[PDB]
Design a protein around this nucleic acid. Structure first.
Ligand SMILES: [Mg+2]
Ligand SMILES: [Mg+2]
Ligand SMILES: [Mg+2]
Ligand SMILES: [Mg+2]
Ligand SMILES: [Mg+2]
Ligand SMILES: [Mg+2]
Ligand SMILES: [Mg+2]
Ligand SMILES: [Mg+2]
Ligand SMILES: [Mg+2]
Ligand SMILES: [Mg+2]
Ligand SMILES: [Mg+2]
Ligand SMILES: [Mg+2]
Ligand SMILES: [Mg+2]
Ligand SMILES: [Mg+2]
Ligand SMILES: [Mg+2]
Ligand SMILES: [Mg+2]
Lengths: 109, 142, 103, 54, 117
RNA sequence: CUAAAACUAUGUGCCGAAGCUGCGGAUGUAUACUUUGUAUACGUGGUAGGGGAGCGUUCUGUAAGCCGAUGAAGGUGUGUU
RNA sequence: GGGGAGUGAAAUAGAUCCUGAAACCGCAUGCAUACAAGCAGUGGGAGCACCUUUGUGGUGUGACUGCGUACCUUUUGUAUA
């Protein structure tokens, strides 16, 4: 049995978050929490939020023990972009997409 | 019924030693390549190496006819702007007899991974002695 | 027992109990056919070779049924010439099973 | 100045094969019991048997 | 009578892309590329139906050569001798006997030799 | 590659095409007898272009019929003609 | 933002809310892949993995190998740079 947590609509791109998600995939929950605690990346904060939520769901709704848990599944998907305009030189205009992601964590023994 | 291919796991390579003293180079090379490819076996399959091992001894006693000992040129290019390099047959035979058989035989084989794997079963030695006495080679009178 | 027979314009090397496909036949599914134009029989260091036929050799077989092979697709095309053409094909066969080889 | 052909999704992932992150050096300060970055003051001001800003 | 091209077009594209499984990149994903890939595959198959019969006869002739040269002849002389002895075994069966039964092939080579002399 | 694996002359074999033969199948035209069914024979590479025969799509009648919550259209796989 | 609880026939009917295709982007399993040169297929063909039967079966992958310079248009003529 895996317990899930979703963080939908993070204001970062999925390519930037997948780097942090690769660092904790398949590790024990305490070790992953340490890795996320001592990171200088911005995606580490959002991933730590989602992981903390998954541990709380596993222990409250399912009543599991925490030292036995693992980061069994984690993946990042793309969200919907925001379209903006950037004025360029000589009257030209560029299109800026501000990207979003969905983080999904699954914690299990 | 249908035509079966030879299984690489059932192939059995054998070991032979051939003496090169007083022999025309290309007329020996054709025999060596035919044995290396396996054309003499009824299980011959063009995509399988069903050939045999050959040991050449006295590689510095091989012969050429005509005036080729002085007139046959071997070329190389180092891939630098003027790096074409030239040598003789007779300078190369008293100094590196392995490369003469290497070139003569490798030119007579296919050109791809299986051809690279066939040329590995040829072992060329300048003198009368080889180290593969544990493999028990047969005297092939080519 | 390794005899050599002719059928459908081709030649086959058969043993007893073997099941094989040949070109379509007119015979009826469940009948029994006999090849009496035999080319060679080998029974173990005993080898009869026909010139062109072994005299008193028989090979009997049974007709299991008739069927079609899997679909082949024919495609003809001419580049830059506005010409394309396509076709399908399934070939008919008769399935025999070898019952006896006389020698 | 610019490409003549688009890049396949395989050659784009081959370039990113050096983009992975590594971990830091973390140790256990059994003077205090906590986890901290090696050679650094802890979150509350402890290092090798001394306390800053008591 | 307004006719919409939604279902039939989608089904045609789908059928073309189902015949391109295993191809690399856009050749199994993009309709424009996969369509040319399927047409070229059909052309190749039409030509290789003809080339298969040449390749297999070449293989039979090579195996018969290997078998005849162990029995003391070349391919040319064994085929000539068998034609002079009214033996009509074809090459597909001769290569089988060469690859699986050495005794019967020695019998055939002896028959050919006898025919030549 | 040198009494050739070159050149000239002669001979015996063999290899070699989607050519020809064998086996199975489809089709055009014309003929022969039933009187619409098969044989026989010749044919069946194609751009521009001419001729012939069809598939599928939306809508009207047939249709106040027939199928459908015991699951329609649509989407996604598999098998088969 | 989610996980339980609860409503409802239905909650991957939860408000960006019927159905939910494709391009595009992930995670998981199987096989292949770091001595080998080119329109990426096609004809062969070993091995491995999973289903199944007592297989001359099915599914996925594809070592090695013969052949092989995209499509449309316009041209006497195009892999055409
Ligand atoms: Mg301005
Ligand atoms: Mg990937
Ligand atoms: Mg001939
Ligand atoms: Mg032919
Ligand atoms: Mg013809
Ligand atoms: Mg015919
Ligand atoms: Mg025509
Ligand atoms: Mg014609
Ligand atoms: Mg649903
Ligand atoms: Mg919806
Ligand atoms: Mg390798
Ligand atoms: Mg390359
Ligand atoms: Mg022009
Ligand atoms: Mg011009
Ligand atoms: Mg051309
Ligand atoms: Mg170019």
């Amino acid at each position: 049995m895996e317990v899930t947590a979703k963080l939908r609509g993070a204001a970062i791109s999925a390519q930037k978050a997948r780097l942090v998600a690769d660092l904790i995939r398949g590790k024990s929950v305490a070790h992953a929490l340490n890795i996320l605690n001592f990171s200088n990346k911005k995606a580490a904060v959002l991933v730590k939020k989602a992981l903390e939520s998954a541990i709380a769901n596993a222990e409250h709704n399912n009543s599991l023990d925490v030292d036995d848990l693992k980061v069994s599944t984690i993946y990042v998907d793309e969200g919907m972009s925001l379209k903006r305009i950037m004025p360029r030189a000589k009257g030209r205009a560029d299109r800026i997409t501000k990207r979003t992601c969905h983080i999904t964590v699954k914690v299990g023994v | 019924m249908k035509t079966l291919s030879a299984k690489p796991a059932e192939v059995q390579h054998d070991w032979f030693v051939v003496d090169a003293t007083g022999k025309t180079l290309g007329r020996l090379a054709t025999e060596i390549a035919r044995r290396l490819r396996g054309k003499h076996k009824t299980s011959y399959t063009p995509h399988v190496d069903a050939g045999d091992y050959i040991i050449v001894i006295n590689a510095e006693q091989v012969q050429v006819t005509g005036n080729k000992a002085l007139d046959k040129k071997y070329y190389r290019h180092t891939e630098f702007p003027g790096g074409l390099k030239e040598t003789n047959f007779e300078k190369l035979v008293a100094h590196k007899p392995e490369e003469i058989f290497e070139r003569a035989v490798k030119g007579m084989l296919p050109k791809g991974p299986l051809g690279y794997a066939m040329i590995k079963k040829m072992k060329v030695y300048a003198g009368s002695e080889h180290p593969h006495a544990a493999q028990q080679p047969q005297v092939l009178d080519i | 027992m390794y005899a050599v027979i002719q059928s459908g314009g081709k030649q086959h090397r058969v043993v007893e109990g073997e099941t094989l496909k040949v070109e379509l036949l007119k015979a009826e599914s469940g009948a029994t056919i006999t090849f009496d134009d035999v080319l060679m029989v080998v029974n173990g260091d005993n080898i009869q070779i026909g010139a062109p036929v072994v005299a008193g050799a028989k090979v009997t077989a049974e007709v299991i049924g008739h069927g079609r092979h899997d679909k082949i697709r024919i495609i003809k095309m001419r580049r830059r010439k506005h010409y394309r053409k396509q076709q399908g094909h399934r070939q008919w066969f008769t399935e025999l099973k070898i019952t006896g080889i006389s020698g | 100045a610019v490409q003549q052909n688009r890049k396949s999704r395989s050659r784009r992932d081959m370039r990113r094969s050096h983009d992975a992150l590594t971990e830091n050096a973390l140790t256990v300060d059994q003077a205090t019991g906590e986890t901290h970055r090696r050679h650094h003051v802890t979150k509350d001001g402890f290092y090798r048997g001394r306390q800053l800003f008591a | 009578a307004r006719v919409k091209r939604g279902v039939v077009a989608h089904r045609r594209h789908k059928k073309i892309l189902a015949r391109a499984k295993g191809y690399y990149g856009a050749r199994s994903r993009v309709y424009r590329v996969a369509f040319q890939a399927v047409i070229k595959a059909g052309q190749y198959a039409y030509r290789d139906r003809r080339q298969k019969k040449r390749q297999f006869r070449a293989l039979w002739i090579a195996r018969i050569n290997a078998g005849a040269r162990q029995n003391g002849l070349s391919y040319s002389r064994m085929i000539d001798g068998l034609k002079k002895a009214q033996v009509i075994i074809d090459r597909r069966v001769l290569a089988d006997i060469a690859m699986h039964d050495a005794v019967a092939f020695a019998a055939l080579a002896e028959k050919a030799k006898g025919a030549l002399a």
